[PDB]
């Protein structure tokens, strides 16, 4: 039972009913969380400094309640953020042009002033275009958006900005959050999911989309944080378009598992240990999909040559045996590698159906001390990869 590092230090959460379980199946995988709300999520407000996340408060529009973010403020003062309107832009949302979002701006910045905060823009992202943006017919436009905001907020403190996109093609949503790295200040993509233009096809398509995603902000490093839209939604996890992390009380979705078990580019897995495929530190053509096995709640498909790799921080070196969790219904071949090099290959792996598991070992493989990267290869194979555990 491997006690593993902070999984990421940007990766957040968009949710406002939080339990304590919720927040200990999460605590080590996710740093922050917002909930368009003036205070903590009320069944966590006391203990979740504890499991070591920090809350961002928001002021969704100009209206919000500042007795009680202050009330809030002054009970918590590892608060260190704020998080401007939200979707200024929308006519549906906060619902201001960019004179007017200047214009309330100093209310917020009275509260950073007297708690010490940072400040992050109004989150905006392309609109119907029903806010009027002086000087342009694209109203719809979220940079003119924040070009006309700053140059209203002369001296304004804005220390961060706030994105929202729900494309669904991964290489869309980063040209798109690259496109605010002009301003010279950190991005937050505080509410992101494969929606629009029809959305994921299936729940799989999502959590490729989000693997895809969370992958370029973590090795972007004008990205601050991150936010998956959502916590949970009211229709659930498996209706489209298959938007929740959370589960039952204390309990991960499939897309949850994925979102939760990616690392950060300097994370380095612990050993002994059990790590979920999905928790790979690179991936080559693997796509995603939900499992049916007795653990695990996401597995690893690969129909050729997919490669995923692990970077492991080994503290004792010594002869480690790998275990691999897999369902291939013809005969698979899974090469291992480390820093490269063949140890290993799992050979004629045959469990008869893609959701028929079974746990494959390998023979003792040597690891040194030290930072290494476990390679593990299709050979021209298809199968389902759950989960790997190396022990010694
Ligand atoms: O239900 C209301 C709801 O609205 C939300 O805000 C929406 C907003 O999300 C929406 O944004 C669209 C956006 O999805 C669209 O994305 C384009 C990209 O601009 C384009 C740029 O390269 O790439 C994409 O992916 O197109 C290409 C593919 O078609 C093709 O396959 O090739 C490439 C992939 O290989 C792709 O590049 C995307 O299609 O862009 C348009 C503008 O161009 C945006 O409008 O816009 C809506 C208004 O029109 C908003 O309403 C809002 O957040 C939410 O609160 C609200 O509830
Ligand atoms: O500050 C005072 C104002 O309070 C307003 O009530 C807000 C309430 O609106 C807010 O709801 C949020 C939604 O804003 C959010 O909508 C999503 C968008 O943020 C996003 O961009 O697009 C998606 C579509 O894909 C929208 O669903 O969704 C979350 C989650 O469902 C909602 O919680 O929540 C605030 C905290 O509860 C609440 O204060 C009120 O409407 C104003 O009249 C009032 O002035
Ligand atoms: O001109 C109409 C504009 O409407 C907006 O809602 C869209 O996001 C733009 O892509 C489009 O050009
Ligand atoms: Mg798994």
């Given at each position: 039972?491997?006690?593993?590092?902070?999984?990421?230090?940007?990766?957040?959460?968009?949710?406002?009913?939080?339990?304590?379980?919720?927040?200990?199946?999460?605590?080590?995988?996710?740093?922050?969380?917002?909930?368009?709300?003036?205070?903590?999520?009320?069944?966590?407000?006391?203990?979740?400094?504890?499991?070591?996340?920090?809350?961002?408060?928001?002021?969704?529009?100009?209206?919000?309640?500042?007795?009680?973010?202050?009330?809030?403020?002054?009970?918590?003062?590892?608060?260190?953020?704020?998080?401007?309107?939200?979707?200024?832009?929308?006519?549906?949302?906060?619902?201001?042009?960019?004179?007017?979002?200047?214009?309330?701006?100093?209310?917020?910045?009275?509260?950073?002033?007297?708690?010490?905060?940072?400040?992050?823009?109004?989150?905006?992202?392309?609109?119907?275009?029903?806010?009027?943006?002086?000087?342009?017919?694209?109203?719809?436009?979220?940079?003119?958006?924040?070009?006309?905001?700053?140059?209203?907020?002369?001296?304004?403190?804005?220390?961060?900005?706030?994105?929202?996109?729900?494309?669904?093609?991964?290489?869309?949503?980063?040209?798109?959050?690259?496109?605010?790295?002009?301003?010279?200040?950190?991005?937050?993509?505080?509410?992101?999911?494969?929606?629009?233009?029809?959305?994921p096809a299936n729940m799989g398509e999502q959590?490729?989309?989000?693997?895809?995603?969370?992958?370029?902000?973590?090795?972007?490093?004008?990205?601050?944080?991150?936010?998956?839209?959502?916590?949970?939604?009211?229709?659930?996890?498996?209706?489209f378009?298959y938007?929740?992390?959370?589960?039952?009380?204390?309990?991960?979705?499939?897309?949850?598992?994925?979102?939760?078990?990616?690392?950060?580019?300097?994370?380095?897995?612990?050993?002994?240990?059990?790590?979920?495929?999905?928790?790979?530190?690179?991936?080559?053509?693997?796509?995603?999909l939900?499992?049916?096995?007795?653990?695990?709640?996401?597995?690893?498909?690969?129909?050729?040559?997919?490669?995923?790799?692990?970077?492991?921080?080994?503290?004792?070196?010594?002869?480690?045996?790998?275990?691999?969790?897999?369902?291939?219904?013809?005969?698979?071949?899974?090469?291992?590698?480390?820093?490269?090099?063949?140890?290993?290959?799992?050979?004629?792996?045959?469990?008869?159906?893609?959701?028929?598991?079974?746990?494959?070992?390998?023979?003792?493989?040597?690891?040194?001390?030290?930072?290494?990267?476990?390679?593990?290869?299709?050979?021209?194979?298809?199968?389902?990869?759950?989960?790997?555990?190396?022990?010694?």
């Amino acid at each position: 039972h491997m006690a593993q590092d902070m999984r990421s230090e940007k990766r957040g959460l968009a949710y406002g009913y939080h339990s304590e379980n919720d927040l200990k199946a999460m605590q080590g995988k996710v740093k922050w969380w917002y909930n368009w709300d003036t205070q903590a999520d009320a069944n966590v407000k006391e203990n979740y400094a504890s499991y070591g996340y920090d809350f961002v408060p928001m002021a969704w529009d100009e209206n919000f309640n500042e007795e009680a973010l202050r009330s809030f403020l002054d009970n918590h003062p590892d608060v260190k953020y704020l998080l401007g309107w939200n979707q200024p832009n929308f006519m549906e949302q906060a619902n201001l042009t960019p004179a007017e979002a200047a214009a309330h701006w100093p209310v917020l910045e009275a509260i950073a002033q007297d708690y010490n905060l940072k400040l992050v823009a109004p989150a905006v992202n392309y609109s119907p275009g029903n806010v009027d943006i002086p000087g342009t017919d694209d109203d719809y436009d979220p940079w003119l958006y924040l070009d006309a905001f700053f140059e209203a907020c002369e001296g304004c403190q804005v220390d961060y900005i706030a994105v929202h996109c729900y494309m669904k093609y991964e290489s869309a949503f980063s040209w798109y959050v690259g496109e605010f790295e002009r301003y010279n200040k950190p991005i937050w993509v505080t509410e992101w999911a494969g929606w629009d233009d029809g959305g994921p096809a299936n729940m799989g398509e999502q959590m490729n989309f989000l693997s895809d995603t969370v992958r370029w902000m973590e090795s972007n490093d004008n990205i601050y944080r991150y936010s998956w839209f959502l916590g949970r939604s009211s229709e659930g996890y498996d209706q489209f378009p298959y938007l929740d992390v959370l589960l039952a009380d204390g309990e991960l979705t499939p897309l949850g598992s994925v979102y939760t078990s990616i690392p950060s580019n300097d994370f380095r897995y612990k050993i002994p240990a059990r790590i979920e495929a999905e928790g790979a530190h690179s991936l080559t053509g693997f796509k995603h999909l939900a499992t049916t096995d007795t653990t695990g709640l996401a597995k690893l498909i690969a129909a050729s040559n997919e490669v995923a790799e692990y970077k492991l921080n080994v503290e004792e070196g010594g002869d480690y045996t790998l275990a691999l969790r897999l369902a291939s219904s013809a005969n698979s071949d899974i090469a291992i590698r480390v820093d490269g090099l063949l140890v290993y290959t799992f050979e004629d792996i045959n469990t008869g159906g893609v959701e028929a598991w079974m746990t494959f070992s390998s023979t003792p493989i040597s690891l040194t001390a030290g930072d290494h990267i476990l390679r593990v290869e299709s050979k021209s194979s298809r199968f389902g990869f759950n989960w790997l555990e190396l022990t010694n």
